Design an enzyme around this catalytic site. Sequence first.
Site, PDB file in Angstrom:
ATOM      1  N   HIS A 160       0.731  -1.067  -0.021  1.00 19.21           N
ATOM      2  CA  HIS A 160      -0.107   0.024   0.054  1.00 19.21           C
ATOM      3  C   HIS A 160       0.797   1.250   0.146  1.00 19.21           C
ATOM      4  CE1 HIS A 160      -3.178   2.733   1.643  1.00 19.21           C
ATOM      5  NE2 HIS A 160      -2.107   3.129   2.387  1.00 19.21           N
ATOM      6  N   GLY A 216      -0.576   5.950  10.760  1.00 10.32           N
ATOM      7  CA  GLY A 216       0.956   5.806  10.735  1.00 10.32           C
ATOM      8  C   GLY A 216       1.403   4.501  10.930  1.00 10.32           C
ATOM      9  N   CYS A 270       0.691   1.460   9.791  1.00  5.14           N
ATOM     10  CA  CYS A 270       0.853   0.479   8.845  1.00  5.14           C
ATOM     11  C   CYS A 270       2.269   0.002   8.851  1.00  5.14           C
ATOM     12  CB  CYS A 270       0.673   1.265   7.488  1.00  5.14           C
ATOM     13  SG  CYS A 270      -1.022   1.626   7.046  1.00  5.14           S
TER      14      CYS A 270
HETATM   15  C1  LIG Z   1      -1.045   0.135   5.989  1.00  4.98           C
HETATM   16  N1  LIG Z   1      -0.129  -0.688   5.748  1.00  4.98           N
HETATM   17  O1  LIG Z   1      -0.496  -1.821   4.852  1.00  4.98           O
HETATM   18  N2  LIG Z   1      -1.925  -1.221   4.456  1.00  4.98           N
HETATM   19  C2  LIG Z   1      -1.970  -0.088   4.895  1.00  4.98           C
HETATM   20  C3  LIG Z   1      -3.443   0.459   4.619  1.00  4.98           C
HETATM   21  N3  LIG Z   1      -3.987   1.801   4.931  1.00  4.98           N
HETATM   22  N4  LIG Z   1      -5.153   2.064   4.436  1.00  4.98           N
HETATM   23  C4  LIG Z   1      -5.623   1.043   3.981  1.00  4.98           C
HETATM   24  C5  LIG Z   1      -6.567   0.849   3.436  1.00  4.98           C
HETATM   25  N5  LIG Z   1      -7.026  -0.519   2.700  1.00  4.98           N
HETATM   26  O2  LIG Z   1      -8.428  -0.522   2.367  1.00  4.98           O
HETATM   27  N6  LIG Z   1      -8.909   0.708   2.849  1.00  4.98           N
HETATM   28  C6  LIG Z   1      -8.293   1.399   3.522  1.00  4.98           C
HETATM   29  N7  LIG Z   1      -8.462   2.684   4.455  1.00  4.98           N
HETATM   30  O3  LIG Z   1      -9.464   2.869   4.596  1.00  4.98           O
HETATM   31  O4  LIG Z   1      -7.299   3.366   4.855  1.00  4.98           O
HETATM   32  N8  LIG Z   1      -4.441   0.161   4.119  1.00  4.98           N
END
Ligand SMILES: *c1nonc1-c1n[nH]c(-c2nonc2[N+](=O)[O-])n1
EC number: 3.4.19.12
Lengths: 306, 306
Positions: free
Chosen positions: A41, A143, A145
């Site tokens: 991501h 943050g 992630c």
């Molecule tokens: C952080 N590390 O890996 N994936 C992330 C991440 N941050 N946001 C997402 C996401 N994926 O689907 N929806 C969201 N979101 O609402 O932030 N993945």
Amino acid sequence: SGFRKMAFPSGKVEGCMVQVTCGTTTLNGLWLDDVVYCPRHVICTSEDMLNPNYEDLLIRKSNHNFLVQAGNVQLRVIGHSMQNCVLKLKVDTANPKTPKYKFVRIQPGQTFSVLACYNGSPSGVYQCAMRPNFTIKGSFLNGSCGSVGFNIDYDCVSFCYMHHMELPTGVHAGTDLEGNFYGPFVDRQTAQAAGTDTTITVNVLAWLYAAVINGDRWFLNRFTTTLNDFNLVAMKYNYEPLTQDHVDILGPLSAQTGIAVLDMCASLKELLQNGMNGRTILGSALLEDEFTPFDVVRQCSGVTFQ
Amino acid sequence: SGFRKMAFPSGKVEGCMVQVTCGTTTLNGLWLDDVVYCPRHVICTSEDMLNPNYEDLLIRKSNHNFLVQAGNVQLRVIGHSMQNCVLKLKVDTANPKTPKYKFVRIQPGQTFSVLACYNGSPSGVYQCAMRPNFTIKGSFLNGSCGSVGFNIDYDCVSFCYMHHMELPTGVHAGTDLEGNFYGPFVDRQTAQAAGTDTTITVNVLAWLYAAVINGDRWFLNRFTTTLNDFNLVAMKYNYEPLTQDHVDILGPLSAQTGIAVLDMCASLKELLQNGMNGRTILGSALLEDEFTPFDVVRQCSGVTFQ
Ligand SMILES: *c1nonc1-c1n[nH]c(-c2nonc2[N+](=O)[O-])n1
Ligand SMILES: *c1nonc1-c1n[nH]c(-c2nonc2[N+](=O)[O-])n1
């Protein structure tokens, strides 16, 4: 004595945490030997993640697009590749603090330690159980992630979790270190949601044994029950069925306390049917299901790691 | 989001833990610069600790009586001295992993992280609050003598606790890193016992604010109350009196949630008077008092350490 939710000492993982920056996005990465592992991501942009094509997104990248910072030292990226939902950034420097490690996927009902991290800087450590619906009840802010989950076994770190996101109910979803999600979630913006959970019956029994070891005995009784008669009560209260294998796993605790597994099932039955009537068990007014039999034996016997 | 009992990352302390052996007794020590700090109880023998004279016991010691092991490397003791209930063993090698540190004594109601250790090998990490009666509800088995408690503040480790013993109720007592006990306990075998505890009111309010931040609002109400009218309910249920200083400490949380401190006191009043009627707050069926206002702001805002 005493019984506490206890994480593994986090030092061996702290020494692997780095910051990965691509464009305007910054998250945590895991630096082992000459590879940095992080969520793919990181290559997404504001518009991209609805139906992002990660294959397309990655081919448009160069090694120099990836800024990897290990403390106050910048690591030079010399290769990039994707494995499922994880990105692998090959760097020119092997991490001198690399512990002995494994990538293991855990089972629902199993526990691990989470090292919460922001901008590559570790923040806190706590224990999580993988829920039967493949979420975890964590504590993650923006943050976080890329923060990893792990167990330690003698001196070897078994990494089992990399954090991705929060679901609408406030629970958390992520992948193993191969980039394969736990549960039916995707690294896309959708209205995905957790789906039904259940209580981890064998862990509750393990915790009741922990309580007896620590002097809490008020819930014990003379009654017994059959494994089949217990499982019929378990279904009414949304508890998982009990297996002879779980009875076998509880053997050592049953022998140390002298309380037959089936007798503790009788006690759990009455607790579910009657409640706790204003009393507590190991300081809790609820039946706790986030400790495995291993966790109980660890803390009510006391092995250390190197 | 999410709210979890969270310890500080333990790496900086793991690198200071050593094993101290004197005679047939082995416990944990804390190696900072060229000094190893450990409980003076290491020089006691089977008979000694009833009314041991530690001054006499120490003068009968030599540096070579003290075996200090840092991993698979033995440290040579070149001096010994006692400060209150701690022993200071000067060694010929400064710990290259010494973090920036302070020795601070904490207050009842304050929290810290415990690194449980056995034979100098760290085992687990968990958060503890110093109870108003100067005990802690820990998890310690035989061999945990000398395990330390600490907080981390940017990159500086403030050591505040060194573990000594378990009291008859299963709670734990120890000293600060100057060797001064928390509470009216001694490092002698006596029938000493904890004495009456109370609930840390400001921490409960902090935790209710944590719950509101995390979407738990069912306990809120329109009512308010006076600080004096609250404190009269607090005494019936064995809660500590509330101070304007505690109201001041809760200011930021009150402003972030828009719930006046005095209104949350009204909610606590009803919770104490009515119970929770089968519901939970942040996954607990009990009012939790082991999180400080700082702990809540930390986790519901998210600072990291280096
Ligand atoms: C952080 N590390 O890996 N994936 C992330 C991440 N941050 N946001 C997402 C996401 N994926 O689907 N929806 C969201 N979101 O609402 O932030 N993945
Ligand atoms: C360990 N580290 O510092 N003090 C100890 C310790 N172990 N046992 C005691 C003790 N002091 O008084 N009574 C006891 N006891 O019952 O073990 N201190």
